[PDB]
Amino acid sequence: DKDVKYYTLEEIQKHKDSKSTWVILHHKVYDLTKFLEEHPGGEEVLREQAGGDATENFEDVGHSTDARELSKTYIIGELHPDDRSKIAKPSETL
Structure with missing residues (x-):
């Protein structure tokens, strides 16, 4: 509709005890x-x-036998790059 608006990680984890998420x-x-x-x-x-x-x-x-992934009619934007793991370090959970 306009452009990929990135949302902070706090905005994605803000939906849970309400209804829509x-x-x-x-x-x-x-x-x-x-x-x-x-x-x-x-x-x-x-x-x-x-x-x-x-x-x-x-x-x-x-929905009509094994349909395909509907990853397009339910997306709002992308994830902010400030949280993406591809700037300073790759990963570390050990």
Whole structure:
């Protein structure tokens, strides 16, 4: 609509005890407030994280057989580069 507006990490983790929330694909934001009712499966969408917090594919099934990832009709912007791990160090959680 205008341009990729990046949101700080505090803006992405601000939704939780309300109703609508977004998700991160390692470098993007996903306003999926409508996905909560756009794809009703087995509560497996917007809740697939465990390996160091990672969401490879969270698209349930039912919408015309195994459909493709709808990563485009539910995105709002990208992740601010100030938090992206590609400036000073790469990673370190040991």
